[PDB]
Amino acid sequence: GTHWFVTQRNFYEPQIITTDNTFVSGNCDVVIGIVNNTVYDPLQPELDS
Amino acid sequence: GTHWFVTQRNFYEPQIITTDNTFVSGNCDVVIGIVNNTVYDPLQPELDS
DSSP states (O other), rough: OOOOOEEOSSSSEEOBTTTTSSSSOTTTTTTTEEEEEEEOOOOHHHHHH | OOOOOOOOOSSSOOOBBBBBTTOSSSSSSSTTTTTOOOOTTTGGGGGGO
16 A cells, blocks of 8 residues: 565565566556556665765 | 577567576587677666766
8 A cells, every 4th residue: 555565476575676576578558557666776776875 | 680689489579688688607618509799788887877
C-alpha cells in the first residue's frame, strides 16, 4: 500500500526495486497495467559520493 | 553481419553485448573459433558524473 517491493513466489522477503533486480525492455506504452515508481540505482550515490 | 548480438535460443531478441549478459573466463587462445568484438561497459559512460 506504500512502496513496491520485489519478492519470491514461495516466500515473502521484502527487497527494494533496483536495476540489478529488474531488466530494461521495451517502453511503458506496451505493457498493459504498467505502474510508475522510483527505480533505485545503486551507482547513483556512488558517483555522487 | 554487422555487430555480434546476444539473443535467446527459443526467441530472437537482439541485445547489445554487455558485461551483465556475459562473464569473463579463460583467454582468447584457448576457445576454438573465437571472434574479436567489443564489449560495452555501463561503468565507462557513467564516469563523467
